[PDB]
Design a protein around this ligand. Structure first.
Ligand code: CLA
Ligand code: CLA
Ligand code: CLA
Ligand code: CLA
Ligand code: CLA
Ligand code: CLA
Ligand code: CLA
Ligand SMILES: CCCCCCCCCCCCCCCC(=O)OC[C@H](COP(=O)(O)OC[C@@H](O)CO)OC(=O)CCCCCCCCCCCCCCC
Ligand SMILES: CC1=CCCC(C)(C)[C@H]1/C=C/C(C)=C/C=C/C(C)=C/C=C/C=C(C)/C=C/C=C(C)/C=C/C1=C(C)CCCC1(C)C
Ligand SMILES: CC1=CCCC(C)(C)[C@H]1/C=C/C(C)=C/C=C/C(C)=C/C=C/C=C(C)/C=C/C=C(C)/C=C/C1=C(C)CCCC1(C)C
Ligand SMILES: CC1=C(C/C=C(\C)CCC[C@H](C)CCC[C@H](C)CCCC(C)C)C(=O)c2ccccc2C1=O
Ligand code: SF4
Ligand code: SF4
Lengths: 80, 139, 107, 161, 60, 732, 108
């Protein structure tokens, strides 16, 4: 699977979670940013590696980082 | 909670874009949603289908195909009543989305953070430092 | 086709220098150039060119002459569009000179 | 002469270059009547060709075995008109263009919309800058020594490494 | 720092590392990155603002 | 599910990508699962023995196939008229005209003529018959086995060296300088004195008679007296017929300078004295480092002490010792950069100063050898910078290198990269600009308006070595100079004869065409360096990917965000510099070959006039010399250049197929493959057959590698077919 | 759109077949001519791939004047067959014969 990380620079804008085409990301409660929430990556086995989350992220360097790893049927986006 | 297998399927005339042998031997995905109308939508795998008034049910090969339909069904038909399942050939049906009844972009209690790194991205360890060591680069 | 068509009939455009067909001889070489130059845009990627621009921006910053319209490498699509346009300009322009100098001389 | 080369005024191969260039034009002129526009066009080209060869022969250029002029660019003063003086002329224009372009980009930074000044150029101000370029060597060196050409390394963005 | 002041960025992976921005707001709450800084250059993402901590920010 | 046994991430991929990626990652032992540093050095040790045996098997096969199928004995009798045979042809696809067309070489069977020069090398070093060619093949077969067994043996539990052995820098350097370089240079001096030089003089010396045949009549008595100059007495006369006793001297150690007048090659006594002197110098060098007896240098101490007190280098080389010892990629890069320069020196000094008898009259061999080694040089030079990029990403630790030369390089990397950018553009604007000026001015009928710069700096260097062609009268060319008078009793008379004959390639005459191409070659060296240096210095991070080091050396991109990040990895700058390396070796070998084929015809003036514009290179070099190659077959027959004529087209085909991998990218191909997967499942009688690995389009990085390989292979095959067939067809 | 896999897979197969059986004939000929085997080539002299359908259509158009275009006096084009038309001693048009090379490049 791919490895998706969220760094504590996340401002809790939820944009990565809305952009994710495979429901990999969700919002969990936090206290390190004004929004009170941080992105989370509980379902990275479903991550296809599109990096739409990274595109959506507005922090100067990406709070969400996708690290392409071992390929599977899910992460290769194979319908066959 | 469990998928009612008897839910009627949207009127579709078929396409070559549907699922192949890997769906019947590895895994299949299903999406259900409630429609207030008998209206035409676009299938992720091809042409146009007609969703029946009431409860609909589809089967797709990829999880992304079910969610791409869910995005369209919520942006043009304002249906937010969609549940996505994973189905294994053993008969096991695995509920997928929304995973705890609340959409991921909305916060929920009892969600535990996975993948969260306590420092910023520039504070990772250099590859040379963790060479021939099992230690992870995230600090 | 290589010997009896391209090699045999390229004689007029190559030996055209010093004649009225020397313009076709120059466009033959110029289009060969544009075609090859297109492969810089076709075989390369934007990420290399933005990082190269960064060092060039640095030398401007050093001399306080950086522009306010921040230079970027061309988009991924525009690199494809620029590569294809110069490939077509170069490829077709080579044949245009080759066809015209050849058939004016012998036909 | 220098590097075993021959002055073009006494090169026999230079002399055959001039003759062959004129025989080539005269045989094209042999196919036209005297007062025609193609005859006058070619007669003016024979005058131009002869003038060029005469000028090169008397200029101190050195010809090779091939009868073509060769340029000596090692720095010797007898040959400074082939690279050093054209080069001095170039660098004056090039530094002018550079000084003038640099002066305008610094002006445009202090503008209401700095990027609108670069796609819509303030032509009276940009012409004020182009006229200033004639003394760029003095203006730019004083700019350097007054600490206004070079910015220190710690106000320049660099990559993390 | 204080709101409205000009600051030189010291986060090495910032787009504006060793560039000058201006402080928009400073959050009194226990936020990890409480200084909001706006810039005139956009980053490669076209963003012109970012949050920073106090030890990543120096007044000029 | 188990082929990449070294990688569980690939062995669990269900696609055809697993087969491709497992093959391409097999030799990157550092990345294999559960790799310790002990096992990494021990596998490299054994696979170095295995590589050595492959080199000995390759050499034995060349010796065997010439002893068996060659005409070495006939060639030795008459080496300027006989064409050397490489090996015989047995191809059941041949027609009977092809069998006849390849039956040259004086034999009754189809054969391939050799362009490698091994006949001239084996003749010069002593080989005379087929039976000692085969004896040498047998020795290499034995040596390959000895090194195959040594590789297996040092993988055994008791014979596996420790990391402390693998990192003994001072003991390895002492032995490789004094034994591997120095003593074998001394032993090669012995071979020439005892075998090669006697057999160049008609006297056979082999294992049968070597212990009873003195190399010198006096014989190891002048050596033990200090009367060493008694070994230079009576050198080979200028009437000497190589291989025979007529005109032969008795000297074994001379410094005559110049060429043997009949072989046009360096004197064998100069070569033996070269290897004796080099061998002594290297043995002394191999006593520099402290091993076990308290004399010598610590390498760590020397590096730590070389910090200039002015502080301009920072901490200097403190901590470089540990950085180089721990990084095999740093070691590989230094080795490849050093090797890359040498194989370029080999190409340059072997065409201007040939050592083998009657080579440099083999225009095909002389051309192929130069082309071969410059291409090897360009590959080695790219690899050094690639492995320098791999070092910074993987093996460089910035905290053990605080304020070093290495860290301070990375601190001004934009100064370095922008100044390469300027010098590349500076060279490119004006070198292309003069050439285009010359083309336009020549096209308009006015070649006298060309910009023709005399390369006076190089001509003055030629004159400094004694070339009396430009009237510069400096140093060696000057008759009464301190330089000229100093060497007069040794090599000056022979060297001035060699450099002032226009009958060899020593310091060839140069003009404006040579000036222009050298500045093009300068453009291509700085531009290739730019891509590779930018790849090495931006490898760890940039402004687009400040965390680029977390992703590795070879990754496809960081996605379409932040403007787009295609080709952003350090690997991708290797990829991009490979095109510039091919372009530069093209410019070098095109120049070498055109300058030589025009000289070999007797028409050096054709290069002199046509090289100053690009149409001269197109019509007078590529188009003019194409005709024997493209007529290797036609509707009127075929000849023995038919194979090169086919390799020529073959090379254009592979080169163009590479464009498909480089222009068209993955998304188009994955969507086609999905329509092919559908059709197979729906086709009756064919869906009975099922793939074990799901068919997928090649990866983003893999397609770059596949296109690069096809591009590169097409480049090599086309030029080799051209440089060999055009030279063969012309013989001049 | 709902059977585009069947369209693209069938077109994909045709293009592979076409490339093998048009450009591979050229590669067969390069090899045979290079190997000295000119009797093994697809040529007018050797194995013949004639364009009989194009030649037949050319036959019909030369027969058309007075037959299937009865009031026409000449053919629509002399490329189909018929006379050589010369103007200023240069050929205006003349029959364009089709052979193995014409069969090969049309399938190209
Ligand atoms: C490759 C290195 C190189 C370089 C950098 C130079 C540089 C120079 N050469 Mg050249 N030269 C070279 C190689 C080189 N040369 C070689 C290999 C030869 C063949 C022997 C020559 C032969 C040559 C001659 C014959 C002369 C020069 C001169 C000069 C100087 C004139 C430029 C000037 O305006 O300064 C001096 C002027 C000012 C500083 C101010 C002027 C206003 C300049 C320093 C000339 C000179 O003056 O020598 C010092 C001169 O007469 N050169
Ligand atoms: C006048 C403005 C100006 C000035 C002072 C400089 C200054 C410099 N540039 Mg250049 N640059 C400019 C414009 C300018 N740049 C533009 C418009 C481009 C886009 C094509 C570039 C692209 C560029 C590259 C790619 C590189 C430089 C480099 C450099 C440095 C070395 C000189 C050189 O290589 O010139 C080279 C100049 C060019 C290749 C293009 C110049 C094109 C024109 C002639 C200049 C623009 C004129 C402008 C419209 C002025 C209008 C003024 C008017 C409104 C009053 C130096 C920092 C090099 C560097 O970093 O080396 C250290 C380098 O590699 N620059
Ligand atoms: C005197 C003792 C001695 C000798 C002869 C060697 C010899 C060798 N060792 Mg070393 N080694 C030694 C002691 C010694 N070792 C000690 C004491 C240690 C421990 C501290 C090591 C530790 C060690 C390691 C760890 C490794 C080696 C390796 C090697 C091999 C290097 C590869 C090769 O063939 O290059 C041959 C090189 C030359 C012949 C000289 C280089 C020539 C240069 C490039 C230019 C020559 C140009 C010249 C004109 C050639 C003309 C050719 C002709 C066609 C005209 C080589 C056989 C490596 C290997 O391959 O393992 C099997 C390896 O991995 N050694
Ligand atoms: C003595 C020379 C030498 C040695 C020991 C190596 C050894 C290595 N190289 Mg280097 N390399 C070399 C020359 C050398 N290379 C040259 C001349 C070039 C320029 C063409 C390169 C360009 C190069 C690149 C660009 C890369 C390597 C990589 C590698 C590693 C894996 C190779 C692999 O798995 O492919 C084995 C392939 C097969 C078994 C299939 C055939 C390995 C450490 C790769 C690596 O993993 O580095 C991180 C990598 O990406 N090398
Ligand atoms: C003929 C083919 C060709 C040409 C000309 C170039 C040219 C160049 N390449 Mg590219 N490249 C090519 C093929 C080519 N490449 C291919 C096939 C690859 C493999 C993908 C690459 C990969 C590559 C990389 C990776 C890099 C380069 C770099 C460079 C530059 C190096 C030479 C230099 O610095 O100054 C030479 C300058 C020129 C040749 C510019 C020509 C001047 C123009 C033509 C002026 C004409 C103006 C005219 C009026 C325009 C008319 C337009 C009309 C519509 C009005 C230069 C821009 C390097 C670079 O940019 O560093 C600075 C670099 O990093 N190239
Ligand atoms: C960065 C530019 C550059 C580079 C990489 C080279 C590289 C090379 N040159 Mg070229 N050359 C250059 C610029 C350059 N040259 C210029 C500008 C001139 C003057 C026309 C020459 C004149 C020249 C001659 C006459 C010869 C070479 C030769 C060579 C080769 C051997 C090394 C040598 O002589 O260095 C030469 C190095 C220099 C001259 C140093 C230039 C460094 C400065 C920064 C460049 C700019 C100077 C500036 C434009 C002039 C100042 C103003 C002045 C007009 C008042 C090598 C390919 C020789 C060769 O082998 O050819 C076959 C040879 O004989 N070069
Ligand atoms: C010479 C260069 C070259 C070649 C051979 C190909 C070959 C091909 N392209 Mg590519 N392409 C190229 C350049 C090239 N392309 C370039 C530059 C671009 C850039 C835009 C593309 C873009 C492109 C696209 C976008 C598409 C293709 C398609 C195709 C295929 C056409 C179908 C076909 O003919 O199958 C027959 C195969 C051939 C003619 C290849 C040569 C085989 C000959 C006959 C010899 C075979 C020898 C035999 C296998 C030897 C076996 C033994 C050996 C292994 C030892 C084929 C694989 C299309 C495709 O795949 O759809 C079918 C397609 O959609 N190409
Ligand atoms: C083949 C190897 C190629 C290697 C190339 C590597 C890249 C280049 C490496 C850097 C070399 C260049 C930079 C250092 C350049 C360099 O040489 O550094 C010299 C020196 C710096 O070296 P150090 O730090 O070792 O010197 C210590 C002093 O700073 C304090 O002790 O600078 C000085 O402070 C002293 C000035 C020189 C002392 C006077 C010398 C004579 C001057 C007058 C001569 C006669 C003039 C009149 C007649 C004309
Ligand atoms: C790439 C590679 C991979 C892995 C790593 C690696 C190992 C280091 C590397 C090495 C590869 C290497 C070094 C590969 C080396 C491969 C070699 C040397 C292969 C040699 C094969 C020779 C044969 C089959 C001859 C057989 C002769 C016979 C049977 C004759 C017999 C007989 C005749 C007639 C007469 C006598 C009597 C009898 C006995 C009857
Ligand atoms: C990328 C990378 C990252 C970090 C790690 C890394 C691996 C180290 C690095 C790679 C770096 C690489 C790949 C570096 C490559 C470096 C190279 C190829 C350096 C070439 C050096 C040649 C020299 C100094 C020649 C000197 C000749 C002289 C002095 C002749 C003198 C003369 C004599 C004697 C005789 C004639 C007269 C004159 C002319 C006077
Ligand atoms: C060279 C190159 C660049 C760098 C080129 C840039 C940034 C554009 C340089 C163009 C200059 C600035 C202006 C163009 C003027 C030309 C001299 C004439 C062009 C003709 C019309 C535009 C008028 C990329 O950005 C790129 C991106 C993606 C794939 C490949 C490549 C690529 O190959
Ligand atoms: S890479 Fe794509 S699938 Fe994976 S988390 Fe990001 S947006 Fe979701
Ligand atoms: S997009 Fe970036 S900043 Fe916004 S929630 Fe996701 S990780 Fe945090």
């Amino acid at each position: 699977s791919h490895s998706v990380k969220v760094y504590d620079t996340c401002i809790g804008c939820t944009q990565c979670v809305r952009a994710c085409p495979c429901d990999v990301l969700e919002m969990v409660s936090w206290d390190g940013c004004k929004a009170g929430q941080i992105a989370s990556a509980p379902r990275t086995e479903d991550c296809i590696g599109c990096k739409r989350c990274e595109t959506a992220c507005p922090t100067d360097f990406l709070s969400v980082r996708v690290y392409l790893g071992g390929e599977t049927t899910r992460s290769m986006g194979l319908a066959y | 909670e469990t998928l009612n297998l008897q839910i009627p399927s949207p009127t579709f005339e078929g396409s070559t874009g549907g699922w192949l042998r890997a769906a019947e031997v590895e895994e299949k995905y299903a999406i259900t949603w409630t429609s207030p109308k008998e209206q035409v939508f676009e299938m992720p795998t091809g042409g146009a289908a007609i969703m029946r008034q009431g409860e609909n049910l589809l089967y797709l090969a990829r999880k992304e195909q079910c969610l791409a339909l869910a995005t369209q069904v919520k942006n043009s038909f304002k249906i937010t009543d969609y549940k996505v399942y994973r189905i294994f050939p053993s008969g096991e049906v695995q509920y997928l989305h929304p995973k705890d009844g609340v959409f991921p972009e909305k916060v929920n209690a009892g969600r535990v953070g996975v993948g969260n790194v306590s420092h910023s991205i520039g504070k990772n360890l250099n590859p040379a430092q963790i060479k021939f060591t099992s230690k992870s680069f995230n600090g | 086709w290589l010997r009896d068509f391209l090699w045999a009939q390229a004689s007029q455009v190559i030996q055209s220098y010093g004649s009225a067909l020397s313009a076709y001889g120059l466009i033959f070489l110029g289009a060969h150039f544009i075609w090859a130059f297109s492969l810089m845009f076709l075989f390369s990627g934007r990420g290399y060119w933005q990082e190269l621009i960064e060092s060039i921006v640095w030398a401007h910053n050093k001399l306080n002459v950086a522009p306010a319209i921040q230079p970027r490498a061309l988009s991924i699509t525009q690199g494809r569009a620029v590569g294809l346009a110069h490939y077509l300009l170069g490829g077709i322009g080579t044949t245009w000179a080759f066809f015209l100098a050849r058939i004016i001389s012998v036909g | 002469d220098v590097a075993g080369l021959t002055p073009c005024g006494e090169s026999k191969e230079f002399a055959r270059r001039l003759d062959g260039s004129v025989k080539k034009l005269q045989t094209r002129l042999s196919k036209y009547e005297a007062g025609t526009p193609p005859a006058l066009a070619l007669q003016k080209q024979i005058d131009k060709t002869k003038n060029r060869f005469d000028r090169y022969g008397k200029a101190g250029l050195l010809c090779g075995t091939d009868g073509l002029p060769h340029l000596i660019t090692d720095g010797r003063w007898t040959h400074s008109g082939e690279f050093v003086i054209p080069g001095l002329l170039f660098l004056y224009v090039a530094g002018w263009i550079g000084w003038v372009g640099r002066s305008y980009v610094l002006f445009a930074r202090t503008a209401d919309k700095p990027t609108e000044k670069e796609i819509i150029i303030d032509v009276p101000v940009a012409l004020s800058f182009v006229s200033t370029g004639f003394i760029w060597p003095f203006s730019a060196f004083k700019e350097f020594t007054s600490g206004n050409l070079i910015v220190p390394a710690d106000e320049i963005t660099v990559s993390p490494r | 720092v204080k709101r409205g002041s000009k600051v030189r960025i010291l986060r090495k992976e910032s787009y504006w590392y060793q560039d000058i921005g201006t402080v928009a707001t400073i959050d009194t709450s226990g936020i990890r990155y409480p200084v909001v800084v706006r810039f005139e250059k956009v980053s490669y993402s076209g963003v012109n603002t970012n949050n920073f901590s106090l030890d990543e920010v120096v007044e000029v | 599910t188990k082929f990449p046994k070294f990688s569980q991430a690939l062995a669990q991929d269900p696609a055809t990508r697993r087969i491709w990626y497992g093959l391409a990652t097999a030799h990157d032992l550092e990345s294999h699962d559960g790799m310790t540093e002990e096992n990494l050095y021990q596998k490299i040790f054994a696979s170095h023995f295995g590589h050595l045996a492959v080199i000995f098997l390759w050499t034995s096969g060349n010796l065997f196939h010439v002893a068996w199928q060659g005409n070495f004995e006939q060639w030795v009798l008459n080496p300027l008229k006989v064409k050397p045979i490489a090996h015989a042809i047995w191809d059941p696809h041949f027609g009977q005209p092809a069998v006849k067309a390849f039956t040259k070489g004086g034999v009754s069977y189809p054969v391939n003529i050799a362009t490698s020069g091994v006949y001239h090398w084996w003749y010069t070093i002593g080989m005379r018959s087929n039976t000692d060619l085969y004896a040498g093949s047998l020795f290499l077969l034995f040596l390959a086995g000895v090194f195959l067994f040594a590789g297996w043996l040092h993988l055994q539990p008791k014979f596996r060296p420790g990391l402390s052995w693998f990192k003994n820098n001072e003991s390895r350097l002492n032995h490789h300088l004094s034994g591997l370089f120095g003593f074998s240079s001394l032993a090669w001096s012995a071979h020439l004195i005892h075998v090669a030089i006697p057999e160049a003089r008609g006297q056979h010396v082999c294992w049968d008679n070597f212990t009873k045949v003195a190399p010198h009549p006096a014989g190891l008595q002048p050596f033990f007296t200090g009367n060493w100059g008694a070994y230079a007495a009576s050198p080979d006369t200028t009437n000497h017929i190589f291989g025979t006793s007529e005109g032969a001297g008795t000297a074994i150690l001379t410094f005559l300078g110049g060429f043997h007048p009949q072989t046009q090659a360096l004197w064998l006594t100069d070569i033996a004295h070269h290897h004796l002197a080099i061998g002594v110098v290297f043995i002394f060098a191999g006593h520099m480092y402290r091993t076990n007896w308290g004399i010598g240098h610590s390498l760590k101490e020397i590096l730590d002490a070389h910090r200039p007190p002015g502080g301009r280098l920072g901490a200097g080389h403190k901590g470089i010792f540990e950085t180089l010892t721990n990084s095999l990629h740093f070691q590989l890069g230094l080795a490849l950069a050093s090797l890359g320069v040498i194989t370029s020196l080999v190409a340059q000094h072997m065409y201007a100063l040939p050592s083998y008898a009657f080579i440099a009259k083999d225009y095909v061999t002389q051309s192929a050898l130069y082309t071969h080694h410059q291409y090897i040089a360009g590959f080695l030079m790219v690899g050094a910078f690639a492995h320098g990029a791999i070092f910074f990403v993987r093996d460089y630790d910035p905290e053990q290198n605080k304020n070093n030369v290495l860290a301070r390089i990375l601190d001004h990397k934009e100064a370095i990269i922008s100044h390469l950018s300027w010098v590349s553009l500076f060279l490119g604007f004006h070198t292309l600009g003069i050439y285009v000026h010359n083309d336009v001015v020549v096209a308009f009928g006015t070649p006298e308006k060309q910009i023709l710069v005399e390369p006076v700096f190089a001509q003055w260097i030629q004159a400094s070595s004694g070339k009396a062609l430009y009237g510069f009268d400096v140093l060696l060319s000057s008759t009464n100079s301190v330089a000229a008078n100093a060497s007069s009793n040794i090599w000056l008379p022979g060297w001035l004869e060699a450099i002032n004959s226009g009958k060899n390639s020593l310091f060839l005459p140069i003009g404006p065409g040579d000036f222009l191409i050298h500045h093009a070659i300068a453009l291509a060296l700085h531009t290739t360096t730019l891509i590779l240096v930018k790849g090495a210095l931006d490898a760890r991070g940039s402004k687009l990917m400040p965390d680029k080091k977390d992703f590795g050396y070879a990754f496809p991109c960081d996605g379409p965000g932040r403007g787009g990040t295609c080709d952003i990895s350090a690997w991708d700058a290797f990829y991009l510099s490979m095109f510039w390396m091919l372009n530069t070796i093209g410019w070098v070998t095109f120049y070498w070959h055109w300058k030589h084929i025009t000289i070999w015809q007797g028409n050096a003036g054709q290069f002199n006039e046509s090289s100053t514009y690009i149409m001269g290179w197109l019509r007078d070099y590529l188009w003019l010399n194409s005709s024997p190659l493209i007529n290797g077959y036609n509707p009127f027959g075929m000849n023995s250049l038919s194979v090169w004529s086919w390799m020529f087209l073959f090379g254009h085909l592979i080169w163009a197929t590479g464009f498909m991998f480089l222009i068209s990218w993955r998304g188009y191909w994955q969507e086609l493959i999905e329509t092919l997967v559908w059709a197979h499942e729906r086709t009756p009688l064919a869906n009975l057959v099922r793939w074990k690995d799901k068919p997928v389009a090649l990866s983003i990085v893999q397609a770059r590698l596949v296109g690069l390989i096809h591009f590169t292979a097409g480049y090599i095959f086309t030029y080799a077919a051209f440089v060999i067939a055009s030279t063969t067809g012309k013989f001049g | 759109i709902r059977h585009r896999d069947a369209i693209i897979s069938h077109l994909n197969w045709i293009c592979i077949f076409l490339g093998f059986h048009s450009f591979g004939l050229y590669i067969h000929n390069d090899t045979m001519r290079a190997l000295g085997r000119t009797q093994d080539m697809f040529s007018d002299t050797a194995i013949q791939l004639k364009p009989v359908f194009a030649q037949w259509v050319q036959s019909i158009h030369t027969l058309a004047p007075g037959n299937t275009t009865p009031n026409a006096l000449a053919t629509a084009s002399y490329a189909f067959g018929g006379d050589v038309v010369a103007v200023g001693n240069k050929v205006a048009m003349m029959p364009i014969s089709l052979g193995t090379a014409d069969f090969m490049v049309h399938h190209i």
